[PDB]
Design a protein around this ligand. Structure first.
Ligand SMILES: *[C@@H]1O[C@H](CO)[C@@H](O[C@@H]2O[C@H](CO)[C@@H](O)[C@H](O)[C@H]2NC(C)=O)[C@H](O)[C@H]1NC(C)=O
Ligand SMILES: *[C@@H]1O[C@H](CO)[C@@H](O[C@@H]2O[C@H](CO)[C@@H](O)[C@H](O)[C@H]2NC(C)=O)[C@H](O)[C@H]1NC(C)=O
Ligand SMILES: *[C@@H]1O[C@H](CO)[C@@H](O[C@H]2O[C@H](CO)[C@@H](O)[C@H](O)[C@H]2NC(C)=O)[C@H](O)[C@H]1NC(C)=O
Ligand SMILES: CC(=O)N[C@@H]1[C@@H](O)[C@@H](O)[C@@H](CO)O[C@H]1O
Ligand SMILES: [Ca+2]
Ligand SMILES: [Ca+2]
Length: 337
């Protein structure tokens, strides 16, 4: 039962996290052979809380594959900048599994992750890579990542370093979501680099009726200002085209969700841009971006935000340009994952 409601996005940080490997070299940050190694941690929800979903940041020397409850969530590489991943969880326990690879001979090896778990009651807790994870001093077995594998006789992971004290130094958090990939959109009265003064509304429905949607993360900005709605409820508003806002929607409807925006032009150029990631209970996700599949209208009707209104006389939104175009450029300040 989910009493959490939409909120400002809360970043997962690496500050409390540790680098782990096998300890085949007992020197932390020491030379390691070219190898692939498994890591697993079964994490349980505290007393009378349900886990709903997680924000994950993972970094690796040299590369990783990340699994949750046996499902591949992502693949990445590199220790200078973390990789953001989002995943729906089982309510009481979750098996996290990572395959790490050292790709350069005589070089250090390590995995670091932070898992920020959101609970049904609106609280959060961060879990990290540390010596409580299990590993093997050998290539991962077939199906090492499945919950049905017994890791009772596996050794403990060896700590290679901490966030602020390691051969790697502190990895930079990635942006919560990319804007690269999204489009500034408006109504088709936006012509020759300017649009009229006024408010315009935009709508996007997601409806995968054979899946169960769990959480959304939304990244949004507008020239000049916006208010954002999900299934008719207020998520938030902003007034900056240089600093983007991020939100968590921890209580999605399971099959049908409507995002609606009232965006206002104070003068000159205008646009709204957003990226939305939706997590599903099977471990999959989908990304939605501002594009021409959104609907837009120039005079905002009463109830423009309700999920099931008649969209008759809404137009296809106009693409003003991909993220990066003048006048706004590529410099948007995006919150950290
Ligand atoms: C959402 O899930 C997808 C599918 O499981 C992940 O990716 C595909 O996944 C990899 C791993 O990062 C991407 O690099 C690929 O590019 C995708 N397929 C392609 C290009 O052919 C993705 O990591 C997930 N996003 C999350 C969990 O945040
Ligand atoms: C992760 O730990 C949980 C909690 O300890 C395990 O689930 C318990 O598993 C026992 C043994 O099957 C069950 O009989 C209990 O009913 C479960 N407790 C709860 C709170 O669900 C779980 O099996 C572990 N998962 C893996 C992959 O090892
Ligand atoms: C869309 O958003 C705009 C901007 O928030 C809303 O605008 C105005 O709302 C009131 C009139 O109802 C004024 O007293 C406000 O001061 C005014 N603010 C601005 C910046 O214009 C607009 O009403 C919104 N809602 C709809 C449904 O349009
Ligand atoms: C008064 C006016 O037009 N201000 C606009 C501002 O809203 C924004 O659109 C900016 C984009 O670069 O151009 C500015 O000149
Ligand atoms: Ca290495
Ligand atoms: Ca403007």
């Amino acid at each position: 039962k989910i009493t959490a409601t939409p909120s400002q996005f809360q970043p997962a940080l690496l500050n409390a996290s540790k680098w782990i490997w096998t300890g085949e070299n007992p020197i932390p940050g020491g030379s390691n052979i070219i190898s692939t190694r498994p890591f697993r941690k079964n994490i349980t929800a505290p007393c009378g809380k349900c886990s709903v979903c997680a924000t994950i940041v993972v970094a690796s020397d040299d590369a990783h594959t990340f699994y949750v409850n046996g499902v591949r969530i992502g693949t990445g590489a590199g220790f200078r900048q973390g990789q953001a991943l989002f995943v729906a969880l089982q309510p009481t326990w979750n098996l996290f599994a990572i395959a790490g690879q050292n790709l350069v001979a005589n070089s250090p090896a390590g995995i670091m992750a932070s898992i920020l778990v959101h609970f049904s009651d609106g609280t959060s807790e961060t879990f990290v890579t540390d010596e409580s994870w299990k590993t093997l001093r050998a290539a991962p077995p077939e199906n090492f990542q499945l919950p049905s594998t017994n890791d009772s006789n596996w050794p403990s992971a060896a700590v290679q370093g901490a966030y602020q004290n390691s051969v790697w130094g502190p990895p930079v958090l990635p942006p919560v979501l990319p804007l690269r990939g999204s489009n500034w959109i408006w109504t088709s009265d936006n012509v020759n680099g300017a649009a009229p003064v006024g408010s315009r509304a935009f709508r996007k429905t997601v409806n995968q009726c054979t899946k169960v949607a769990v959480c959304a993360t939304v990244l949004i900005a507008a020239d000049d200002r916006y208010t954002l709605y999900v299934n008719g409820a207020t998520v938030g508003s902003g007034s900056s085209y240089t600093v983007a806002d991020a939100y968590t929607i921890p209580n999605l409807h399971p099959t049908f969700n409507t995002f609606a925006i009232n965006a206002t032009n104070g003068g000159g150029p205008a646009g709204v841009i957003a990226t939305i990631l939706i997590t599903y209970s099977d471990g999959s996700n989908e990304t939605v971006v501002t594009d021409a599949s959104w609907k837009a209208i120039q005079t905002i009707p009463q109830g423009f935000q309700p999920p099931l209104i008649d969209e008759f006389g809404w137009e296809s939104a106009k693409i003003i340009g991909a993220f990066g175009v003048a006048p706004w450029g590529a410099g948007m300040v995006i919150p950290s994952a």
